[PDB]
């Protein structure tokens, strides 16, 4: 039902497995998975994207913007490029 | 109506959704299913406000507008420790690097 | 190609902007060339005068990010039997996390300083692979 | 009742003919065309008189001054031009609209020109200076027709936004908007000769006669085809009281103004009849057709 995604700095993020399968990487990598290179202020945002993606995919209720603060954009870009999501 | 939450204790964060009309007690059942501890051994919080088992999440201040999938609302979680409860303690996430010159 | 047909059959349309972006309607003329039209503020609507068989797409007006209209890429006013204006509901697509990340970076760094960045060199290409309407039109017609 | 029969076909334009207008003195017919030319013809014999040229793109409309000496024309090149008809020379080019100019008219005094454009504005111009005196934010969609009433005190405009609006010439103020529950594009509008009524065409195969003071519709005329082009219509007042209009089935339609029944249909054109005109003193109709025809026809009736 759930998986645990652990950041580089030890934070443990517990998310629905279906939500984690949003990332093609995580599908292959996968219960528990460590991300030695992704810190917690980035992994938490990745989990938010998982929630956002599953909630608003194939819905016609008005889609809001996914917000990304400037300070996290590059790492999130690298995380997203790594995660293939 | 769905609310979208982060239940946080120490270095643990649970991402879950719930109905605005569901109860604090029902949210503890979600936590129990994941972190083993029974509802009677849990204390849930909105900021520094202890939430009562019988209140709905809406009644505590978690609504569709304030608790969104791309910006979930935080629920603090504290466990029983021996004769009493541990203090509420949420470890902050890592800090972001300063903005490179290009920005 | 993908082009409007000179039907001369008038058709009223509501351009309804249910997105947070400033929207730029693009009409494909009778030679298939994109023509830009006045922009829509987010959360606003406008009744406009168009024609049956005329092709429209919708983009972010400052960045040319592609947008959805009635859950698809292209809008053509269809048969009207009730006399009401046809709704063109413009919405945000669910962008991939990567794509949305590219959008936010492009908005903060000028394209001169793209390669002045601490990122895997491969993503340099993705940053400068901007959305433009002509790129999609070749895409759309080759589908 | 009327018995219009074809007398002359005027050939010469090389594209769609957009507008025909009899000179107020009855001597001349001016025609405009998508071929960018204006032509002058004898009103009674059809004899070609001269060609007037200067516009850079096609022309939608042409209109005479009260004394039959000047013409104004409205062009896709975004200007109007004022022409001295006897010399064929362009006196002024009226610049200011930001898109196609579709319609034009002089006021009865012929010191002012009114114009309406795809750009949703109505502009009032000084004939002598060529300067724009007023830009009215008249509509929210293309303006299909503009017309001064009998004493020049009012302007009526029509638009694809569904409205007819009546404007005070001197102040520029909108005095009345003609609005109904259903609002199809208004493709043509004209004051009746006494200025009390307004004839409006809509792109649903309907012409309507509005009471200006009451702001209410009194008569409708149907049976013709009009869903695509802005077809020019007229009051025929020299014999019986008719309404005259072109039609997208290549016919000129003539209705009894009072009863609203069709009384004649004129066959002869080989494309959409987009312009009709009624002679000021004789029972003569001019009609003009689009690209598959390119001619003007003159028809005469005994009543």
């Amino acid at each position: 039902m759930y998986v645990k995604l652990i950041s580089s700095d030890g934070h443990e993020f517990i998310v629905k497995r279906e939500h984690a399968l949003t990332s093609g990487t995580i599908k292959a990598m996968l219960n528990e998975v460590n991300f030695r290179e992704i810190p917690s202020h980035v992994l938490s945002k990745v989990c938010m994207y998982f929630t956002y993606k599953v909630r608003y995919t194939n819905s016609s209720t008005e889609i809001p913007e996914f917000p990304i603060a400037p300070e996290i954009a590059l790492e999130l870009l690298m995380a997203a490029n790594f995660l293939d999501c | 109506m769905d609310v979208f939450l982060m239940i946080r204790r120490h270095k643990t964060t649970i991402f879950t959704d719930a109905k605005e009309s569901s109860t604090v007690f029902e949210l503890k059942r979600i936590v129990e299913g994941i972190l083993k501890r029974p509802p009677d051994e849990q204390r849930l919080y909105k900021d520094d406000q202890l939430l009562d088992d019988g209140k709905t999440l809406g009644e505590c201040g978690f609504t569709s507008q304030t608790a969104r999938p791309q910006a979930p609302a935080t629920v603090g979680l504290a466990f029983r420790a021996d004769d009493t409860f541990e203090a509420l303690c949420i470890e902050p996430f890592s800090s972001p690097p300063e903005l490179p010159d290009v920005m | 190609v993908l082009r409007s047909v000179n039907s001369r059959e008038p058709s009223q349309v509501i351009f309804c902007n249910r997105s947070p972006r400033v929207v730029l309607p693009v009409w494909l003329n009778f030679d298939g060339e994109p023509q830009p039209y006045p922009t829509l503020p987010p959360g606003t609507g406008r009744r406009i005068h168009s024609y049956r068989g005329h092709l429209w797409l919708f983009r972010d007006a400052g960045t040319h990010d592609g947008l959805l209209v009635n859950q698809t890429e292209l809008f053509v006013p269809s048969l009207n039997v009730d006399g009401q204006p046809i709704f063109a509901n413009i919405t945000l697509p669910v962008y991939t996390l990567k794509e949305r990340c590219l959008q936010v970076v492009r908005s903060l760094v000028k394209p001169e300083n793209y390669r002045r960045l601490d990122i895997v060199r491969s993503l340099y290409e993705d940053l400068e692979d901007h959305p433009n309407v002509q790129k999609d039109l070749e895409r759309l017609t080759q589908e | 009742k009327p018995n219009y029969a074809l007398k002359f076909t005027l050939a010469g334009h090389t594209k769609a003919v957009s507008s025909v207008k009899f000179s107020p003195n009855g001597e001349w017919l001016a025609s405009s065309s998508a071929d960018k030319l204006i032509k002058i013809w004898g009103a009674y014999d059809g004899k070609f008189e001269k060609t007037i040229s200067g516009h850079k793109l096609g022309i939608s409309d042409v209109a005479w001054s009260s004394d039959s000496n000047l013409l104004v024309s409205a062009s896709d090149d975004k200007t109007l031009k004022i022409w001295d008809v006897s010399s064929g020379k362009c006196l002024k080019t009226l610049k200011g609209h930001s898109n196609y100019v579709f319609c034009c008219n002089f006021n009865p005094q012929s010191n002012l020109i009114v114009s309406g454009s795809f750009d949703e504005s109505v502009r009032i111009w000084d004939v002598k200076t060529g300067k724009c005196l007023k830009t009215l934010p008249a509509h929210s969609d293309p303006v299909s027709a503009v017309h001064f009433n009998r004493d020049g005190s009012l302007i009526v405009s029509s638009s694809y936004d569904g409205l007819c609006r009546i404007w005070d010439t001197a102040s520029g103020q909108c005095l009345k908007t003609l609005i109904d529950d259903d609002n199809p594009p208004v493709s043509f509008v004209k004051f009746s000769p006494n200025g009390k009524y307004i004839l409006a065409a809509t792109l649903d195969n309907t012409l309507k006669l509005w009471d200006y003071s009451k702001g209410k519709c009194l008569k409708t005329y149907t049976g013709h085809k009009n869903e695509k082009y802005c077809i020019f219509a007229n009051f025929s007042v020299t014999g019986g009281k008719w309404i005259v209009s072109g039609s997208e089935d290549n016919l000129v339609y003539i209705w009894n103004l009072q009863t609203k029944e069709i009384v004649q249909k004129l066959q002869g054109h080989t494309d959409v009849v987009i312009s009709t005109a009624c002679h000021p003193t004789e029972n003569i109709i001019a009609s003009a057709a689009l690209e598959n025809d390119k001619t003007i026809k003159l028809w005469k009736s005994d009543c």
Side-chain angles (χ1 to χ4, degrees), chain A residues 1-36 38-57 59 61-85, chain B residues 2-79 81-97 99-100 102-103, chain C residues 1-32 34-117 119-120 122-137 139-141, chain D residues 1-149 151-182 184-303:
Chain A
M1 183 47 172
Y2 291 91
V3 306
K4 181 185 295 160
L5 319 177
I6 315 180
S7 67
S8 81
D9 58 327
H11 271 274
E12 302 186 20
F13 294 98
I14 301 163
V15 298
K16 268 160 304 240
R17 178 187 245 265
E18 186 230 320
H19 285 203
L21 299 190
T22 289
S23 151
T25 300
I26 280 176
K27 277 210 292 293
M29 266 170 160
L30 164 156
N31 251 320
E32 220 163 297
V33 168
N34 253 289
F35 294 98
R36 307 305 191 172
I38 307 172
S40 66
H41 78 303
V42 177
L43 194 52
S44 62
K45 205 84 190 194
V46 162
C47 295
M48 298 178 188
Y49 179 81
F50 293 165
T51 319
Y52 170 88
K53 198 239 107 159
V54 177
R55 167 63 179 83
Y56 288 116
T57 278
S59 109
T61 88
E62 185 177 316
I63 310 304
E65 192 92 69
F66 191 79
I68 300 174
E71 295 81 328
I72 76 154
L74 308 85
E75 293 167 285
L76 201 61
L77 178 49
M78 304 185 243
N81 189 54
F82 172 83
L83 279 153
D84 182 33
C85 61
Chain B
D2 296 319
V3 300
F4 298 85
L5 306 170
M6 281 186 303
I7 305 171
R8 310 198 53 210
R9 167 193 180 267
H10 287 40
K11 293 178 76 146
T12 298
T13 293
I14 304 171
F15 283 82
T16 188
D17 59 81
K19 301 293 184 194
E20 208 175 283
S21 66
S22 62
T23 58
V24 171
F25 179 86
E26 277 153 3
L27 198 57
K28 290 182 184 190
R29 288 289 268 176
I30 304 287
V31 171
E32 176 190 47
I34 296 170
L35 298 175
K36 320 291 187 176
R37 307 298 290 277
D40 275 4
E41 303 181 355
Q42 300 176 35
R43 276 180 180 172
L44 298 188
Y45 294 88
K46 180 161 160 52
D47 307 306
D48 296 20
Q49 188 80 6
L50 179 66
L51 308 185
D52 298 334
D53 282 2
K55 279 184 146 208
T56 70
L57 302 186
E59 287 169 344
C60 306
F62 301 112
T63 69
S64 289
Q65 325 293 313
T66 72
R68 295 161 290 171
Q70 67 280 5
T74 298
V75 186
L77 163 69
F79 285 146
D82 291 338
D83 52 309
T84 189
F85 279 82
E86 69 191 1
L88 179 63
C89 176
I90 298 165
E91 198 68 55
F93 299 134
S94 47
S95 271
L99 276 159
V102 299
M103 315 175 183
Chain C
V1 201
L2 292 205
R3 60 177 200 88
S4 301
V5 67
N6 189 21
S7 81
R8 300 298 301 251
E9 299 189 17
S11 172
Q12 273 162 70
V13 173
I14 310 283
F15 284 173
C16 195
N17 184 11
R18 326 170 176 282
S19 94
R21 314 289 190 82
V22 175
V23 161
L24 166 86
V26 177
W27 178 60
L28 310 185
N29 71 23
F30 308 110
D31 298 322
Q35 308 293 131
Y37 267 70
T39 64
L40 294 144
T44 71
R46 221 275 191 187
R47 189 186 51 143
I48 58 96
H49 159 71
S50 187
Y51 294 88
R52 266 254 281 183
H54 282 202
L55 268 65
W56 294 86
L57 48 92
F58 299 82
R59 322 290 283 214
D60 183 302
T63 83
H64 279 31
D65 289 322
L67 299 167
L68 296 185
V69 49
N70 297 342
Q71 303 299 330
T72 182
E73 292 214 84
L74 296 188
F75 168 84
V76 186
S78 46
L79 186 88
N80 184 320
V81 312
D82 52 35
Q84 317 167 10
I86 299 170
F87 262 80
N89 306 296
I90 305 140
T91 59
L92 251 202
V94 184
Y95 294 122
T96 76
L97 179 55
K98 180 179 194 189
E99 195 50 71
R100 176 76 188 126
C101 285
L102 300 166
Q103 295 177 15
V104 187
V105 180
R106 299 187 188 122
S107 74
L108 300 155
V109 51
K110 313 185 201 303
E112 319 142 12
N113 324 330
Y114 271 14
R115 276 149 199 280
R116 183 77 277 283
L117 281 185
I119 279 67
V120 156
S122 99
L123 289 174
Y124 288 152
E125 285 143 287
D126 307 355
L127 289 141
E128 56 196 20
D129 184 16
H130 293 48
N132 70 69
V133 315
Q134 195 62 237
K135 182 172 112 87
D136 287 307
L137 288 177
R139 283 201 330 87
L140 273 309
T141 192
Chain D
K1 288 200 52 47
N3 63 325
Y4 280 95
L6 170 73
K7 300 292 169 188
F8 305 95
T9 293
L10 283 38
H13 284 291
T14 53
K15 295 186 74 59
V17 185
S18 57
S19 205
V20 286
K21 306 283 180 76
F22 286 108
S23 64
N25 69 16
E27 289 296 291
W28 306 107
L29 184 84
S31 63
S32 62
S33 160
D35 70 12
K36 320 192 197 82
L37 306 181
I38 295 157
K39 281 169 189 299
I40 313 294
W41 322 73
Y44 306 100
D45 56 3
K47 174 182 147 214
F48 168 77
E49 178 60 26
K50 80 185 67 187
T51 298
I52 302 170
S53 56
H55 275 302
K56 285 79 61 198
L57 296 171
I59 308 172
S60 282
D61 198 21
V62 69
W64 294 85
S65 65
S66 304
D67 62 4
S68 307
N69 287 326
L70 310 181
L71 277 177
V72 61
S73 59
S75 175
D76 293 338
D77 68 23
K78 303 152 77 175
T79 72
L80 309 101
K81 284 171 184 282
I82 310 180
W83 309 90
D84 181 274
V85 173
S86 68
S87 76
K89 299 298 150 264
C90 172
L91 301 179
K92 305 285 166 275
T93 298
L94 315 179
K95 287 234 37 173
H97 281 295
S98 58
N99 219 323
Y100 321 122
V101 191
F102 285 146
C103 46
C104 48
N105 259 315
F106 286 92
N107 67 342
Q109 198 178 4
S110 290
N111 64 309
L112 294 180
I113 289 166
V114 64
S115 67
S117 162
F118 193 97
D119 72 18
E120 312 171 4
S121 85
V122 167
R123 282 173 181 250
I124 301 171
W125 310 80
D126 184 87
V127 166
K128 199 186 316 291
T129 80
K131 197 228 183 73
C132 186
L133 304 184
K134 284 185 175 67
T135 298
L136 309 180
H139 289 276
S140 62
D141 267 313
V143 177
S144 49
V146 289
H147 189 234
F148 280 103
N149 70 340
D151 66 2
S153 51
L154 302 182
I155 296 166
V156 67
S157 62
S158 57
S159 166
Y160 272 57
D161 65 10
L163 310 174
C164 299
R165 280 180 161 148
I166 290 92
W167 308 86
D168 182 88
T169 301
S171 65
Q173 185 195 7
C174 180
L175 303 176
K176 189 172 287 210
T177 297
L178 304 185
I179 292 169
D180 224 322
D181 293 284
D182 208 15
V186 191
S187 48
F188 165 81
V189 74
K190 208 195 214 287
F191 278 107
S192 65
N194 69 12
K196 298 215 299 150
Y197 304 101
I198 284 160
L199 181 73
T202 46
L203 294 186
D204 60 5
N205 322 284
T206 315
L207 279 151
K208 282 194 277 278
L209 186 70
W210 286 76
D211 176 297
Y212 166 57
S213 176
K214 296 144 158 76
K216 82 161 301 284
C217 170
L218 293 182
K219 311 264 188 162
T220 74
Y221 310 88
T222 56
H224 66 309
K225 284 222 188 172
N226 187 15
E227 297 179 337
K228 301 188 195 319
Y229 301 96
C230 293
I231 298 178
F232 208 95
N234 302 271
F235 303 83
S236 188
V237 300
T238 50
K241 315 301 198 175
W242 321 122
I243 301 288
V244 177
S245 177
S247 183
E248 290 157 12
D249 61 3
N250 303 357
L251 305 175
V252 178
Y253 279 65
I254 305 178
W255 293 262
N256 182 300
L257 187 145
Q258 294 284 337
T259 68
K260 304 163 292 171
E261 56 201 347
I262 298 164
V263 291
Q264 215 190 346
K265 294 152 61 176
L266 314 185
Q267 154 164 244
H269 283 291
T270 54
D271 206 342
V272 166
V273 180
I274 204 175
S275 186
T276 54
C278 298
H279 193 271
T281 50
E282 304 289 337
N283 301 322
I284 302 173
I285 291 174
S287 58
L290 294 180
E291 194 82 359
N292 208 15
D293 179 306
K294 311 179 185 199
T295 69
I296 303 124
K297 290 176 185 298
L298 295 166
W299 324 71
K300 302 182 188 189
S301 179
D302 292 316
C303 71

